[PDB]
Design a protein around this ligand. Structure first.
Ligand SMILES: CCCCCCCCCCCCCCCCCC(=O)OC[C@H](COP(=O)([O-])OCC(O)COP(=O)([O-])OC[C@@H](COC(=O)CCCCCCCCCCCCCCCCC)OC(=O)CCCCCCCCCCCCCCCCC)OC(=O)CCCCCCCCCCCCCCCCC
Ligand SMILES: CC(C)=CCC/C(C)=C/CC/C(C)=C/CC/C(C)=C/CC/C(C)=C\CC/C(C)=C/CC/C(C)=C/CC/C(C)=C/CC/C(C)=C/CC1=C(C)C(=O)c2ccccc2C1=O
Ligand code: HEC
Ligand code: HEC
Lengths: 104, 210
């Protein structure tokens, strides 16, 4: 379960399912992950700066760490999210946050 | 409508066949193909803030629109008849809907905003800065149709949200958040410090305490 925790609600992605007994040939969505590499050829200056980006060549607002999935159980302010899990199985949670540190 | 496609071709032939040649086919390294972009994407540029800039640039200014509302519709119907794609939300009369696109939820109209789109912008709706020479604009100017069309026809470096990704309902709610959200004093103090402390300290220097 891809547990994204954004500002004041949750989203569960179901990144992958593979039952040991044998079932659920399911996977997540590799697309939708768009970086924010500000690798413009030139900035405000005339030449030379060729700024790549603040940190590791990327701007702080990147959200490449956030992983997305096909089945998203987004929680609205008026609809509490309900992550449904199979009983008896090993459930991994891949935790991430969109905006701010918080807890799960 | 026959007239809307006809007018669209005449206005298209005189503005963007330089970057989208002939029937909405993109000019390589000047502009993209306009096949599949549809009326709402055309709504998101000439009707919305980001009218395309003739000088090539990472981002464009929401420069003043170069086409009027009937013209924006004629230009749009040309690219929806040529291409086939998203259409701008319209009211019962047939005008581009703005008030109808105001979502009932602002609480969830907001929660949607923070997970989806708040980050490139501001929680306030103020701009954010982005990729190469790319910024996320302040969404204060945008009317509600503008708001729905940035999401349905993802502009440039702005993630595209399909009606399936964000439902027509939520897009209205999103509009509701990103719209509901949208001498003597220094001179006298400068005297009383700089000038008057200077004068008084000078007097204390010249004069004598006693
Ligand atoms: C604003 C901050 C500007 C940066 C300067 C920061 C340094 C401040 C040092 C003063 C602190 C010491 C103190 O409290 O007592 C000083 C002084 C004397 O204290 P005292 O010990 O109780 O009196 C016995 C002395 O023996 C009294 O004997 P005296 O009268 O013969 O002492 C005079 C000697 C010693 O006494 C002084 O006056 C020392 C002041 C020297 C600092 C001023 C020059 C540097 C800034 C110039 C602006 C650029 O005077 C001089 O050598 C020439 C100084 C001419 C006075 C100019 C002060 C006004 C200009 C600053 C305001 C303009 C701001 C623009 C930015 O009293 C003052 O407050 C002087 C005026 C304070 C000026 C800063 C204004 C805030
Ligand atoms: C004031 C007084 C001695 C009255 C005597 C009692 C009496 C007869 C009262 C009857 C009249 C009544 C009804 C009075 C009540 C209110 C009143 C005073 C009304 C009249 C106002 C008037 C015409 C004259 C008052 C002028 C006066 C004595 C002001 C204080 C001056 C002094 C001792 C200043 C301290 C010296 C000094 C180093 C000053 C510079 C340091 C700083 C920053 C001081 C604070 C400061 C000041 C003092 C500013 O004036 C000022 C103005 C604009 C922006 C900022 C400031 C500011 O930060
Ligand atoms: C250089 C001059 C230039 C002119 C004039 C111009 N465009 Fe563009 N257009 C561009 C460039 C460059 C982009 C890429 C930026 C973007 O994707 O938003 C673009 C983007 C678009 C898009 C969004 C494509 C997408 O899906 O991302 C549409 C729709 C569009 N133009 C239509 C028009 C219409 C309609 C007119 C005029 C009546 C017009 N353009 C005038 C260059 C131009
Ligand atoms: C990086 C992620 C990103 C997401 C997600 C995103 N935007 Fe944007 N947005 C941008 C960037 C970058 C632009 C500049 C492209 C343009 O304006 O043509 C932009 C363009 C706009 C404009 C252009 C009109 C104006 O005001 O100048 C509006 C309005 C807008 N976005 C609002 C939204 C709303 C409302 C959502 C979702 C409910 C959203 N955006 C989703 C980054 C994003």
């Amino acid at each position: 379960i891809d547990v994204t925790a954004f500002q004041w609600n949750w989203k569960f992605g179901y990144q992958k399912i593979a039952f040991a007994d044998g079932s659920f040939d399911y996977d997540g969505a590799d697309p939708e992950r768009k970086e924010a590499m500000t690798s413009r050829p030139e900035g405000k200056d005339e030449h030379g700066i060729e700024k790549v980006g603040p940190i590791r060549g990327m701007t702080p607002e990147d959200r490449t760490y956030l992983n997305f999935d096909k089945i998203e159980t987004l929680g609205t302010s008026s609809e509490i999210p309900v992550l449904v899990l199979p009983a008896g199985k090993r459930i991994e949670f891949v935790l991430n946050s969109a905006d701010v540190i918080h807890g799960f | 409508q026959s007239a809307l496609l006809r007018t669209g071709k005449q206005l298209f032939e005189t503005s963007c066949v330089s970057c989208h040649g002939a029937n909405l086919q993109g000019v390589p390294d000047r502009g993209p193909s306009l096949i599949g972009t549809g009326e709402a994407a055309v709504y998101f540029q000439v009707s919305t803030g980001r009218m395309p800039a003739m000088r090539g640039e990472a981002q464009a200014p929401s420069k003043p629109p170069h086409f009027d509302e009937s013209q924006i519709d004629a230009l749009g119907a040309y690219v929806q008849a040529n291409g086939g794609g998203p259409t701008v939300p319209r009211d019962d009369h047939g005008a581009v809907a703005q008030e109808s696109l105001i979502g009932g939820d602002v609480a969830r109209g907001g929660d949607l905003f923070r997970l989806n789109c708040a980050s490139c912008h501001n929680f306030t709706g103020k701009g954010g800065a982005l990729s190469s020479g790319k910024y996320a604009p302040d969404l204060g100017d945008a009317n509600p149709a503008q708001i729905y069309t940035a999401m349905l026809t993802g502009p440039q470096n702005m993630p595209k949200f399909s009606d399936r990704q964000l439902t027509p309902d939520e897009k209205r709610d999103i509009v509701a958040y990103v719209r509901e959200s949208a001498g003597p004093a220094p001179e006298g103090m400068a005297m009383w410090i700089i000038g008057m402390v200077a004068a008084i300290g000078v007097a204390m220097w010249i004069g004598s305490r006693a």
